[PDB]
Amino acid sequence: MASMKTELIRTISLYDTIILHRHVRPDPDAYGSQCGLTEILRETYPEKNIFAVGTPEPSLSFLYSLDEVDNETYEGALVIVCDTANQERIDDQRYPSGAKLMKIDAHPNEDPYGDLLWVDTSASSVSEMIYELYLEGKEHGWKLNTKAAELIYAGIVGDTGRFLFPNTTEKTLKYAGELIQYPFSSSELFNQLYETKLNVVKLNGFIFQNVSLSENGAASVFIKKDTLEKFGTTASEASQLVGTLGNISGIRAWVFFVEEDDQIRVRFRSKGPVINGLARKYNGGGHPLASGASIYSWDEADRILADLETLCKE
C-alpha cells in the first residue's frame, strides 16, 4: 500500500531515537533490510540517535557493525523490526519497550505485531521493501548513500541466490539495476559473499564424489560426527552445502542428514516433486521445493529415504 509507506516515513520523522532489530541468526536479507534502513536514516537524519542492534553473524560482519545500547535509550524511542515473522525470533527482545513498534516484513502475517505494520508477501525480500520505502521517502528528503545501496543490494542478491530463486520478481531486477549505479564494487561484494574455506570446499568435494542417484532421481547425503571431524567443519557448514547438488543431471529431489549434538538436522530440496508433505510427516515443514525437519535416530532417516524414493518414483 502506498499510504502505508507514507505513514512509516511520517512516523520515522517524528522520533529522535530509532532503534532497529531483525531476526536471530541473521542472513543477508536481515543485514540489508535492518542495516540498509539504518544507514538511510543516519544519512538523512544526522541529528537523530539511530542504532542497529543484535548479535552479529561473523561471515556477514564485513557488511556493517552493530551497536550496544542501554536499556534507558529505549525510553520514548521508535523501534523498527525488519524481516521477522515471529516475535520470539526477534534478536534482542527489548523491542516492545519503546514508545512505538513498527513491523516491516515479507513473510505471512501470522503474528501481526506492531503499532504500524507493513507486510507484503509479494516482495522478494525485505531489502527490496526497504528500497521501495526509500523510493517514496525520497520526496520527503530521504537520502540513499553508497553504503546503503550496497547493503540493500547485498540483501537482495543474498536472498534470491543472485536472481536465481523463484522469489525474484520484475521489481527485484529493476531495483538491482538502480542500485548497481552506486559506486560500490559489486565484484568485491560477490567475492566476500562466496568466499569458502578450503576445508568446507573439500567436504563439498567428498559429497560430490560419492553422491549417487536412484533410477528415480532421488539422492541422499549423510554427514555424521565422524565426517565433520575428518574435515574439521561445523554442522552448520555441512548443512549449508545442501543447495550444491541442484545442477546434477537427472536429480529430482534429495535430502541432507547432518548429525548435530541434540538432533539430526534434515534438509529437503526438490527440482519438481513437492516435499512439503514428506517434511510434515516427520514433524517439520517448509515450502514445496525446500523444507526441513529434526529427527532423533538413524532409523527415522532410512524411513525418510524410502518415502523420498516413492515421492520421486511418482
Curated annotation (Swiss-Prot):
The keyword Hydrolase applies. Its cofactor is Mn(2+). It is an enzyme of class 3 (hydrolase). InterPro entries: DDH_dom, DHH_sf, DHHA1_dom, Oligoribo/pAp-PDE_c-di-AMP_PDE. Pfam families: DHH, DHHA1. Disulfide bonds: none annotated. The keyword Hydrolase applies. It catalyses: adenosine 3',5'-bisphosphate + H2O = AMP + phosphate. Its EC number is 3.1.-.-, 3.1.3.7. SUPFAM superfamilies: DHH phosphoesterases (SSF64182). GO terms for molecular function: 3'(2'),5'-bisphosphate nucleotidase activity; exonuclease activity; nucleic acid binding. Keywords: Exonuclease, Hydrolase, Nuclease. Bifunctional enzyme which has both oligoribonuclease and pAp-phosphatase activities. Degrades RNA and DNA oligonucleotides with a length of 5 nucleotides and shorter, with a preference for 3-mers. Directionality is controversial; shown to degrade 5-mers and less in a 3' to 5' direction, and 11-mers in a 5' to 3' direction. Converts 3'(2')-phosphoadenosine 5'-phosphate (PAP) to AMP. Tetramer. PANTHER family: BIFUNCTIONAL OLIGORIBONUCLEASE AND PAP PHOSPHATASE NRNA (PTHR47618:SF1). In accordance with its dual activities, is able to complement both orn and cysQ mutants in E.coli. Belongs to the NrnA oligoribonuclease family. This is Bifunctional oligoribonuclease and PAP phosphatase NrnA. It comes from Bacillus subtilis (strain 168). The gene is nrnA.
